Amino acid sequence: DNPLGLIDPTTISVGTMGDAKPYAFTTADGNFTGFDIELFLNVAGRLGFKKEQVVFTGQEFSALMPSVANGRFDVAAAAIGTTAKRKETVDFSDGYLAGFLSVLTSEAGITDAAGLKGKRLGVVQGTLQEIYAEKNFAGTDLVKFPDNNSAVSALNNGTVDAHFLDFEAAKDYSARYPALKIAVNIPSFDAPAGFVIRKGNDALRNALDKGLKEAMQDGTWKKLHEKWFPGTPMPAAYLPKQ
């Protein structure tokens, strides 16, 4: 039987990113790791799927949701913000991360949103950052990149003034390139990360929701958060209750 409506009932095919450190990324042997990866494998494990029964495929951010919508993957896990706009084509599990959208730059003069006037801002195609900048940073020239790596390369080259990306990923680039600093932090608590599933796949959605709640209640979520995001605040919503 196929109760979870999977492509193959013995395996879970997950669409992710090889370059979204520390959320999702690859090590030197090409295997996937990061917070979202370890959390997903933990949730899948509770559903009776061992680590060898979960396959990961790296894709550019913009291809993830359409690949799930087209039946290429059972799930997508890559700090995917939950929105009504995204809910038009896919379904989401309950939220498991809520953080900031960050402006990474070597220009100390940029201190807030109003500092982005007369600046060239990098965004990754299809991200919540692209939408936010189009709505709130009108007049700021946007430069669309397929990934963070290309955007940061143009930031290091001096072709863009700043790059707009996820807080933990901005922190990672700040460590890799010390001249780059997080100058602006924008709340994105209204779009928590959720595991993406095929629109209407209620059996897989409900089963992932059960595992996520259990991982949060037994303190697994807390342990994984402390590992991948040291010094980042943890909300009571995702921590053990009572």
**Binding site residues, ligand SNW, CB under 6 A:** 17, 20, 23, 61, 78-81, 97-99, 124, 127-128, 166, 188, 191-193
Minimum CB distance to ligand SNW smaller for 97 or for 152: 97
Q: What span, in angstroms and rounded, lies between the C-alpha atoms of 187 and 11? A: 36
CA angle 109, 119, 127 (to 5 degrees): 110
> In 3D, which of 57, 171, 8, 42 has the Cα closest to residue 103?
171
* Residue 80 beta carbon to ligand SNW: minimum distance, rounded to whole angstroms: 5
* Residue 102 beta carbon to ligand SNW: minimum distance, rounded to whole angstroms: 9
Strands (E) across 85-179 are located at: 90-92, 100-105, 120-124, 141-145, 162-166
Distance of CA 132 to the CA centre of its chain: 16
Minimum CB distance to ligand SNW smaller for 5 or for 58: 58
Minimum CB distance to ligand SNW smaller for 21 or for 198: 21
List C-alpha distances in Å: 157 to 27, 167, 170, 177, 213: 26, 22, 17, 12, 44
* Residue 233 beta carbon to ligand SNW: minimum distance, rounded to whole angstroms: 12
* Residue 168 beta carbon to ligand SNW: minimum distance, rounded to whole angstroms: 7
Minimum CB distance to ligand SNW smaller for 166 or for 172: 166
